[PDB]
């Protein structure tokens, strides 16, 4: 239908027989693409503009497995463990530059990711229903201690056990990159070929499986990680063994499973599945404590871990990755709510994916027409199924299969709020109903921002602004989107300029004083400055930092805000912007009065930028305040101000930046892209005709230079090293100047 990717000069390497592939990422930037086309390098790309593919050569051979730990930049780099965890943060998150995290894995295939940080999060949604829980009763939190919770300090590492060997993995690196290798060959004997389960209730990691249906022991080795310093003395406590139910089934004994995986919660779920050719038998087992029925067999410690079976399913299937990676609670009687949970997905190597709800396995959609997993709890997948030289596509992501608009939007807002509270990237928009309801969504958002906040919104406003912006993006109201983006950039600019009050000790603080400066005279800011204060505002002689970067920017912004007033009959119901807040305009007035003080101190003030400063910002501030009394609180917009703003002086330039992001409206409509060859069609200025510097690409509009040629403006650079507002998509778009 859409989402057309490709490959430029690669192929399936028909001379080479095959190679098992894999890819998985929990947070955003999902794609890893362990695949040798035409071993070869590793790949990285985000869900937005996936055609901007990045890759980097590996440091090993056959590239068995790879997996991340936290949302930050970290990969595994298997095949003797060369190139382990090392964040990038250099220019963007699209360049490996792996550091010396090389684990001393000699001739091994490390396949495991452990040393978990915190406690997980549950989904008590139906018991809460977002009525008045204020996000507390909805997203519960289990209180326990993860492994190696040494020093309340969750040290980070990859102490695990490889696939080739059965001994150990080491080199956990809290600030010191300590190898601390050990030796525990899984009870002094064994061989394995399966993958690992993350963690149990307590701090333990148990996994073993060797051959398949014929030889079916499933051993387990309870372990204790952090005991001593400068060394690891990992344990090897033998745990009860398991098997596959198929061995006693007289139908067929030639199954030989190859997956035998199971979810991260080792409480009651064991999901060993058969992997015959020629068969596909999935099975859910039990992990609970039980007792042996050894009684009444004669004249006449009972608690024994007899891992029995719970349910099974017999069909045909080839490969799969995961069933439901985030996790809900028990006692779930919410059959009416069809949230995407408690499910499973199977992949046909010569075919498509079948998604079925687990624990019933009754029936569901088919999704007709080297394993694929899900993105998050939402129904989002990637098409890495490689029938040869095949790229990735998209299929029906509809988690809610029946038609129920109210319940659909309820699920949508629930998932969005869960994403926001997790501080993760949000991509449930691929499940959106027709964009008209988007308004209602953001409507509920405001309620979630205010009603059931209850006071948390003070620190969540910055994020929720960009959240609702990107929400209304895929909607005919893109003007509202760019208006919200401008609101964001001005709000953060004001919030970074305010703490510059290095005042002498006074009776009160500069923050609350500048805040109360809003309650000031009507006009003539030259009077307001003497009304509040004029002395304690200087902070540096080399104040020449905002003139070439910020002063012209804020001046252009306010001047566009001026000239927007006569543009009432625009091809849009709100035109270009609203100017109905006043609070943001109050921050703008604080900015203009403080830069007036700056000009009084440092002559590198903000000019009118065209001519005839006869300064000229006086009447500007006057009309801003005139609409302010019309836009402070509980007031309507005025006609005299219209006449006052209509005419223009010889000081009115144009060509404002309007920081925004390029669109991606490929729901089911249109997508003009390929696997490569993007076809072409800034805040601190630095937007020339063609870039001639680093020009570190970013999420939406920044694309700012990496060094920035700064002397003391390091506040901005040190502020935007991490993600930005709609600016987590830090790209490495080349300097293909033309």
């Amino acid at each position: 239908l859409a989402y057309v990717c490709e490959w430029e000069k690669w192929a399936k390497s028909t001379y080479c027989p095959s190679l098992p592939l894999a890819c998985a990422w929990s947070c955003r930037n999902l794609i890893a693409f362990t695949t040798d086309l035409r071993t070869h390098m590793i790949h990285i790309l985000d869900t937005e503009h996936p055609w901007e593919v990045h890759s980097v050569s590996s440091g090993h051979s056959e590239a068995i497995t790879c997996l991340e730990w936290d949302q930050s930049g970290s990969r595994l780099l298997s095949a003797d463990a060369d190139g382990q965890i090392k964040c990038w943060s250099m220019a963007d998150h699209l360049a490996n530059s792996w550091e010396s995290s090389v684990g001393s894995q000699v001739e091994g295939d490390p396949i495991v990711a452990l040393s978990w940080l915190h406690n997980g999060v549950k989904l008590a949604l139906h018991v809460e229903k977002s009525g008045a829980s204020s996000f507390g009763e909805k997203f519960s939190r289990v209180k326990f201690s993860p492994s190696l919770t040494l020093f309340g300090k969750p040290m980070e590492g990859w102490i695990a056990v490889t696939v080739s060997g059965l001994v150990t993995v080491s080199l956990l690196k809290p600030s010191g990159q300590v190898l601390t290798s050990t030796e525990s060959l899984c009870r002094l004997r064994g061989r394995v070929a399966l993958a690992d389960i993350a963690f149990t209730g307590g701090g333990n990691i148990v996994v073993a499986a060797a051959d398949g249906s014929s030889a079916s022991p499933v051993k387990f080795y309870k372990v204790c990680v952090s005991v001593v310093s400068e060394k690891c003395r990992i344990d090897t406590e033998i745990l009860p063994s398991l098997f596959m139910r198929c061995t006693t089934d007289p139908n067929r004994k030639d199954r030989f499973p190859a997956i035998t995986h199971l979810k991260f919660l080792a409480r009651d779920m064991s999901e060993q599945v058969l992997l015959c050719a020629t068969s596909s038998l999935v099975e859910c087992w039990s992990l609970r404590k039980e007792g042996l029925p050894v009684n009444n067999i004669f004249q006449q410690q009972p608690m024994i871990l007899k891992w029995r079976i719970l349910s099974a399913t017999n069909d045909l299937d080839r490969v799969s990755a995961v069933a439901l990676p985030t996790n809900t609670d028990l006692k779930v009687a919410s059959d009416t709510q069809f949230y995407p949970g408690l499910g499973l997905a199977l992949a046909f190597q010569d075919g498509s994916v079948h998604m079925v709800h687990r624990l019933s396995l009754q029936t569901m959609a088919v999704f007709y027409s080297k394993a694929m997993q899900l993105s998050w709890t939402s129904l989002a997948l990637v098409g890495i199924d490689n029938h040869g030289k095949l790229s990735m596509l998209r299929i029906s992501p509809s988690l809610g299969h029946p038609l129920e608009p109210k319940l659909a939007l309820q699920h949508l807002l629930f998932l969005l709020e869960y994403c926001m509270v997790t501080g993760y990237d949000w991509w449930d928009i691929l499940l959106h109903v027709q964009p008209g309801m988007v308004q209602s969504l953001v409507e509920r958002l405001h309620e979630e921002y205010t009603r059931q906040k209850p006071a948390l919104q003070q620190v969540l406003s910055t994020r929720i602004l960009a959240m609702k912006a990107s929400l209304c993006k895929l909607s005919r109201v893109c003007d509202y989107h760019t208006k919200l983006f401008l609101m964001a950039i001005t709000s953060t600019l004001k919030s970074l300029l305010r703490p510059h009050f290095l005042n002498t000790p006074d009776k009160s603080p500069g923050d609350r004083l500048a805040e109360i400066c809003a309650k000031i005279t009507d006009v003539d800011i030259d009077k307001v400055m003497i009304n509040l204060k004029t002395e304690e505002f200087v902070l540096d002689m080399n104040t020449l930092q905002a003139l070439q970067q910020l002063l012209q920017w804020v001046g252009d912004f306010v001047l566009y805000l001026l000239v927007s007033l006569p543009n009432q009959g625009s091809p849009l119901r709100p035109g270009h912007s609203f100017l109905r807040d006043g609070t943001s305009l109050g921050m703008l007035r604080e900015l203009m009065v403080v830069i007036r003080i700056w000009g009084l101190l440092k002559p590198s003030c903000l000019p009118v930028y065209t001519a005839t400063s006869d300064d000229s910002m006086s009447l500007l501030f006057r009309l801003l305040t005139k609409l302010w009394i019309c836009c402070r609180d509980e007031g309507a917009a005025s006609p005299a101000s219209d006449g006052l703003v209509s005419r223009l002086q010889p000081k009115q330039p144009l060509r404002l930046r309007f920081g925004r992001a390029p669109t991606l409206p490929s729901s089911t409509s249109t997508l003009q892209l390929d696997g490569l060859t993007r076809a072409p069609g800034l805040h601190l200025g630095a937007y020339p005709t063609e870039e001639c510097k680093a020009c570190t690409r970013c999420g939406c509009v920044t694309m700012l230079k990496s060094p920035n040629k700064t002397t003391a403006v390091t506040q901005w650079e040190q502020r935007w090293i991490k993600n930005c507002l709609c600016g987590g998509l830090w790209r490495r778009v080349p300097l293909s100047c033309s």
Binding site: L117, F151, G152, G423, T714, Q715, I721
Partner: protein, 192 residues
């Protein structure tokens, strides 16, 4: 003797100001609490100290804290001075609770008591207005302050920049003698 604790929060607010803050205040932390300018053997006798670092909760996807200074042999702390991370409020209370639990563990198992003192450093005027939805602590910054000063006799302190934050007013709840009245224009005092 030789007992200190550092808690850095003003990353985005005192990025460049941190160099001057170290040159004017962090020097006596080693010059007075040790023989002079610092390679020495590291023991668990109590002569060692700790240092905690916390970032903004907003400019953070999932990670909260990265505290690492059990002993540091009184020199490894000098090693990672410039090894700090950078990122508007800050919500530093979740990081002060880390030092709370750290000194709790110290008093619990590292008790040989050298009355280890603790110092906080901030540039933004932080406040974790939501004191709920946390992991193992549900208190505000004032509750944490009175617990670390009133309940626990650990000497608390906060070294503010030339500006005037709200913690200079929050100092009034420091029941134990903190000696935070005169500012350290001369060499810093062991009790600020």
């Amino acid at each position: 003797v030789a007992d200190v604790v550092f808690v850095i929060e003003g990353t985005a607010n005192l990025g460049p100001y941190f160099e001057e803050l170290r040159k004017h205040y962090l020097l006596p932390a080693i010059e007075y609490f040790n023989g002079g300018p610092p390679d020495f053997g590291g023991d668990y006798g109590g002569t060692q100290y700790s240092l905690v670092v916390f970032n903004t909760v907003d400019c953070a996807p999932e990670s909260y804290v990265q505290c690492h200074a059990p002993t540091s042999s009184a020199y490894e702390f000098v090693t990672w001075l410039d090894g700090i991370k950078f990122m508007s409020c800050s919500l530093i209370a979740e990081g002060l609770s880390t030092a709370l639990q750290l000194f709790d563990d110290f008093k619990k198992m590292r008790e040989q008591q050298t009355h280890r003192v603790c110092l906080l450093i901030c540039n933004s005027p932080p406040y974790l207005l939501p004191a709920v939805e946390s992991t193992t602590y549900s208190g505000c910054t004032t509750e944490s302050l009175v617990q670390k000063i009133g309940e626990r006799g650990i000497h608390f302190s906060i070294v503010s920049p030339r500006k005037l934050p709200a913690l200079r007013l929050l100092f009034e709840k420091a029941a134990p003698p903190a000696l935070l009245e005169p500012l350290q224009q001369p060499a810093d005092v062991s009790q600020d």
